[PDB]
C-alpha cells in the first residue's frame, strides 16, 4: 500500500521529532536523551518498552498529538488493502 518514497520520509520523522524532546528537557524552567529515542520509537510501533513519560508542558504538548500521528498513518494502512 505504500511507495518507496513513503518509508524513507516517515522513517526520518521519528528521529527529527525525538530530538525536539531533549532540547525541551534541558531548558525546563527529567528525561534523558537515550530514553527519548525509545519513547519516540515505541508509540508508532505500539509496544511497551521502558518508560518514556516526559515532564514540562512544552515537552509534553508535543506528546499530546505525537501518539495521534500513529493513528492516521496506521489507519490509512488498513484502508488501502480494503480498497
Amino acid at each position: 500500500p505504500f511507495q518507496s518514497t513513503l518509508w524513507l520520509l516517515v522513517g526520518l520523522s521519528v528521529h527529527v521529532v525525538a530530538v525536539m524532546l531533549y532540547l525541551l528537557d534541558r531548558f525546563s524552567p527529567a528525561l534523558t536523551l537515550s530514553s527519548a529515542m525509545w519513547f519516540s520509537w515505541g508509540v508508532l510501533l505500539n509496544s511497551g518498552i521502558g518508560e518514556g513519560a516526559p515532564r514540562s508542558f512544552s515537552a509534553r504538548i508535543l506528546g499530546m498529538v505525537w501518539a495521534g500521528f500513529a493513528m492516521i498513518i496506521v489507519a490509512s494502512y488498513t484502508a488501502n488493502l480494503a480498497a
Binding site: V17, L24, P29, L62, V65
Partner: peptide
Amino acid sequence: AAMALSLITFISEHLFYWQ
C-alpha cells in the same frame, strides 16, 4: 503546525516563570 506552536508555549512559560 503543532511543533511551531510548541516553541511559543515554551517561551511563554519560560518568560512568565522568569518574573
